[PDB]
Design a protein around this ligand. Structure first.
Ligand SMILES: O=C(O)/C=C/c1ccc(O)cc1
Ligand SMILES: O=C(O)/C=C/c1ccc(O)cc1
Lengths: 177, 177
């Protein structure tokens, strides 16, 4: 068996791509936006840092960490590697939807309404994060230092807006004229 | 530690909600649509069936399986249970997008183009499955026996269309006038 903390590898290498960071700084990033879409078990961060140091991908000189030439190459090779799209992530709500025949019209409406309200609230939170990001002076573009953050946030916003619209569509079907 | 095959529990109970199925029939469903959004390690299906039988949720009389009253209740309670929305599923592509600063404009365009072409092809496949579903005589509505299948398929179609549109938007930003 391989070590599950290896899921943090490219998250850590990527965080160091623009220059040196302390362990505190790295840990802080996992508690901010990165934790929203690439969650760490916080006990796994320092061990994985140590592994990547010992593998020669990172060096340290508070300890301050940077990428080595080997680490930059490891990051690069991963970034440009083409992979098949992965298997669909299990959404327990969607399994319930598959078995909707076991619910009455009202029970189905209540199930989907609960999900809609929760997804709208998540969407609200993401929109808050988006407005914080966009409160920067420099306009957004490919060349912006914040473009990567913009990509993960817009992706999330679109994803949740689409989920909300789909739930609305289904509630309208449950509530057919 | 809990047994990982327990992830199949409600998939199996739900498959039996409309009446008796053979193990072959159940296994077949996991190789059809259910496997696309709720994948089984096929070695885990018969063991989990046995566990749910031994727990009194399913009974058998080829073995033919049905839900017991206890199993119907177990399914029902799960269907109506409200859960917080789960943590966002790790999308490795999106981690790469977060670290896009490490790529040139052309490398970013190539990364996103590869992803777009793959997502369009997945979308094509889902649209094929959708057309197969909709080739039924009886029009689609809440009362259709196929409504649950419609829900998981439309969800998937919307999800992938949205991913494709987002990738298109980003490629247009990478290719700014
Ligand atoms: O994918 C998600 O669920 C959330 C992503 C996210 C990305 C950047 C933020 O600033 C906040 C949330
Ligand atoms: O969520 C997915 O990726 C796919 C779902 C799916 C659902 C019903 C089908 O008939 C085919 C694919």
């Amino acid at each position: 068996a391989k070590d599950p903390m290896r899921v943090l590898k490219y998250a850590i290498l990527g965080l160091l791509r623009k220059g040196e960071l302390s362990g505190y700084d790295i840990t802080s990033y996992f508690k901010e936006e990165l934790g929203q879409f690439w969650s760490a078990k916080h006990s796994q961060i320092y061990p994985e840092l140590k592994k990547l140091t010992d593998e020669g991908f990172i060096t340290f000189r508070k300890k301050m960490y940077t990428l080595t030439d080997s680490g930059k190459q490891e990051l690069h090779d991963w970034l440009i590697r083409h992979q098949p799209i992965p298997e669909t992530v299990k959404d327990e709500f969607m399994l319930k939807a598959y078995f909707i025949s076991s619910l009455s019209r009202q029970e189905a409406s209540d199930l989907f309404t609960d999900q809609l309200l929760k997804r709208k609230a998540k969407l609200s939170d993401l929109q808050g994060s988006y407005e914080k990001l966009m409160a920067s002076a420099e306009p957004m573009s490919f060349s912006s230092p914040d473009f990567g953050h913009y990509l993960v946030l817009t992706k999330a916003l679109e994803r949740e807006k689409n989920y909300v619209s789909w739930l609305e569509s289904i509630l309208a079907m449950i509530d057919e004229d």
